Design a binder for this molecule. Structure first.
Ligand SMILES: Oc1ccc(-n2cc(-c3ccc4ccccc4n3)nn2)cc1
Lengths: 114, 114, 114
């Protein structure tokens, strides 16, 4: 799986240990082993949410399965949670895009997962 | 909705109020309220369009509904217009990807839209 | 077509010509004239793959058609090769998402491809 965060929060306010935490928490929630999880944090970004430049987050989670209504509800509770706890962003200023990828449309190790 | 502009144009060339104007303009066009539109500009990027590194842009608009043939056509006139006027980028060096999101696949405020 | 790669490899590890080379190789592979190919490389990124900060990369390829099982396998082999040969990234630390875009959902030059 693949989680990307884009946030107007400056790099300094991102803790050490944050990528490891995202990695272990997403592994636990998706059931995918940590070895297959990728995280990408993008601080210091030039973004607004609803006209205002208070702290915010634009994110995405791509996964081959383990995507759907109840799972996405759960994932968003877990992620908004970490973004609030660790980056002090308020959940109503977070948007997450969820992608259920087909194995044929994901490339890895010179080939695809199909 | 979620709007991102990646561009090779440098930061100093992005006018102040560009985010505001995008927020306000995407609101009118989509019919979505300004307060839920989130915008994101990424300037000073290493990119090429057509082999060339003359000014160019790659955008994306994610949205639950309001994504369709005529709407997208309307949005592209609107967003190219703005990119040309304010960033001095030629429209024929702009790609916009439109994504119509299912509500269950968009997280916000500890849950999803579904 | 549109190729984006984000990597925690430094700006200086990216050799000159890389964008041009991607543009050309993607023109051949996609069967599209380079006039329509856009590439975008994002070095220095804060990211992790399998919870490790060794070199890695997260890419995507967006195209109106030209996306499918046998083709994606061929893209991956081509693109993982360029990312190994030019950025010293191990192919088992590259993920590439492929997206088959509908003409109507891609904007360019004040309009859509529809
Ligand atoms: O990445 C995404 C995808 C979709 C959206 N999205 C938000 C909304 C939304 C939010 C609030 C609204 C309030 C009134 C009417 C429509 C509204 N639509 N629609 N699409 C946001 C981020």
């Amino acid at each position: 799986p693949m989680f990307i965060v884009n946030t107007n929060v400056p790099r300094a306010s991102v803790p050490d240990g944050f990528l490891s935490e995202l990695t272990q928490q997403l592994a636990q929630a998706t059931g995918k082993p940590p070895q297959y999880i990728a995280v990408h944090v993008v601080p210091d970004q030039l973004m607004a949410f609803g006209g205002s430049s208070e702290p915010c987050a634009l994110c995405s989670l791509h996964s081959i399965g383990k995507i759907g209504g109840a799972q996405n509800r759960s994932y968003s509770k877990l992620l908004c949670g970490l973004l609030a706890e660790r980056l002090r962003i308020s959940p109503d200023r977070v948007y997450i895009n969820y992608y259920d990828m087909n194995a044929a449309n994901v490339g890895w190790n010179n080939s695809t997962f199909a």
